[model samples]
Target: HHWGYGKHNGPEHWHKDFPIAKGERQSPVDIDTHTAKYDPSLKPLSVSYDQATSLRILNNGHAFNVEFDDSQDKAVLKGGPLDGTYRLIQFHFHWGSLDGQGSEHTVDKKKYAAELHLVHWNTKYGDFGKAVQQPDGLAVLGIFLKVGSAKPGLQKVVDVLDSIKTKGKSADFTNFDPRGLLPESLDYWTYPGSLTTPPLLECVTWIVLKEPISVSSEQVLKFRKLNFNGEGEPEELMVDNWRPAQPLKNRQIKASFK
Candidate 1:
């Protein structure tokens, strides 16, 4: 094995520099643009933020994704929101040095600042692994952030970003409610897809929320502070960590409305 030839080799060069980098899955991408299509019946759901629920922040090392479960499975996915009981798994984000060009959703090749991926699984369908296969398998609540007044709910999440700054290091987040990160509106987009990272499993049914929760300039800055040293020494990188966008072939990208 020469150097930077295969899996471990390259990951150490790239992925290792960023913990989640070596995984079959990844985050953040230089989004160029997207196709627009609306599913009229797919109106946004009425999501209640700041609701009382069981919240746990896990130190994934790469990022801290907040899990949202009302302490109960089989929560109603009202409307055409994949009628089933889904357990809130985790919540993560993708950001950059600046806001105007960090998000994965690219509008006219324009990165809409920053974005968040609130991941969930359909317990009715199966566990996270099995459920990730069917057409109605996965459900991701997405929110976009441009430049504006920071959302109050995001304060709690941002307050804890520093806890996981070091690679492979984590802590138990307190005073948390995963829902607090969600935006006011529920209208979201849906489609069948795969994990953004490696092993890009093409079994995900994506649901990107149109409404993005507001956040302040400082909140956005916090994201740039994340990096990794567990994978290897800090030779190939620093604080800037993000994943490149995948190939979206001739696929149907559906939105909640027109």
Candidate 2:
């Protein structure tokens, strides 16, 4: 809404200027979880973390990025076509360095201060990236975050924020694992869909966790402390690193043990 009006997406003011927001499908929905449907194909998710793991980061345009070592984020499934296992291809995040919030999905009218997307795929087809090209190709585990006491899981990530303190900058640490970044409980909301990003492809099997990882106000304050200016003057300090929500088309959302 901050960017202001467009025909497909724009602030209300843009409605007058263009005419898109009125018809666009923005995310972070406010629907009651109790109302979605259940897709038996999605089995419960389980992943383990041990001492021999680490998280590497990238300085993609989405500043302050992180990825799980492919070996550690391993998970299992039993009801889907692949119905066996998938490895953590990589785990990265999306956030607003400042305030508008960065979660791709929403609950109620409120938006979490930020959100994280951990991408995974079934490598049965061979390479993980190749799998992503198919219809039943990907699974994106999402978690929401709010400004509070940095949840213990978040602390694992907090430990590295200082390292990627500048835009287009990052490092690799061998002692960390992505599982530690997930909230303890596995209870989540599941649905069938596609990548939230373009190609706007409709192939993802979505798993949106019900619980959240909390972060202290200081964590958020420290977030704004990083730089997000473009690559030319990358160190130029910035915050607010989020994208507007996309539309929710012919899709059914369901929650487990809600």
Candidate 3:
């Protein structure tokens, strides 16, 4: 059966195919600030995104994604908890049907409106496909979304939603900077974790920001409007696409800020 956010095939049933779903160091863990160890040695993240490398956006049945050209060293992510440069591959989000909860990772056991993932692959591992299952293969920068004032940067992404409402739909998007979507502070909690989706590869070094970006309620609604089904198929509303928080096991979350 295909993996999805449904009662039968959703996150709860993922272990049937990808047994690693229940492995140690899984992602989307609750960020208990009090329990996190503060570190002064971790460097602030260095993000260099070339607007020209932003190819386009697409709805891939699960979530809306913004893909970037990773063939060159144009868009790069370094520092933080990473040992080397990781190429910017793509970015996507997970949200809830209601405004009260949607974020995949919670802070102090608090779920935000949504969560953003900026995925990148280690250059030493060659490409995403080869690096997805290694210990130091991938690095994902996560940002939380809160409901408040309208976000002009996010509106740019929301505005194009109408064009890619259904699965497989895509359009060329240019001159857009993904960096603008980040919060003011780069303070983050880093830990070893796996992808929140199947095949749940345990290759990620997660860097979740301490701050959240604001978005209007209207913008949150736009995300729910996406159809997980393709043309000629019944439309399945894409909401609550986030996987539940996993156990922390033996891992520790290190904070970059005091």
Instruction: Please name the candidate that would achieve the greatest TM-score relative to the true structure.
Output: 3
**Cα lDDT for residue 36, candidate 3:** 99
lDDT per residue for candidate 1 within 1-258, as digits (tens), equals 222223453323554443434333332322222565776766446443344344556545444566655445523343445665556666777666666665665544566667777666767765777776665566666677776888777887777767766556665765565566666667666655555544345555566666666778887777666554444556322222334454445555666765
On residues 1-258, what C-alpha lDDT tens digit does candidate 2 reach at each position? 223112343223433433433333323344456567555655566654443244676555445666555654344332332354566556665556455465657776457777777776765656666776676677667888877776665666666767776556778855665666678786677665655433334556667777878877776676666654444663644444444544556556776653
Whichever of 2 and 3 has more TM-score, that candidate is 3
- Residue runs of model 2 more than 4 Å from their true location after superposition: 1-31, 38-42, 71-82, 97-100, 198-200, 230-238
Per-candidate TM equals: 0.74, 0.75, 0.97
Reference-based TM-score, model 1: 0.74
For model 1, the run of ten residues with the poorest summed lDDT: 24-33
User: How well does model 2 score by local distance difference test?
Assistant: 0.58
Output the better candidate (2/3) by lDDT: 3
> TM-score rank, highest first?
3, 2, 1
TM-score of 3: 0.97
* Residue 113 lDDT, candidate 1, scale 0-100: 66
Give the Å error, residue 243, model 3. Answer: 0.3
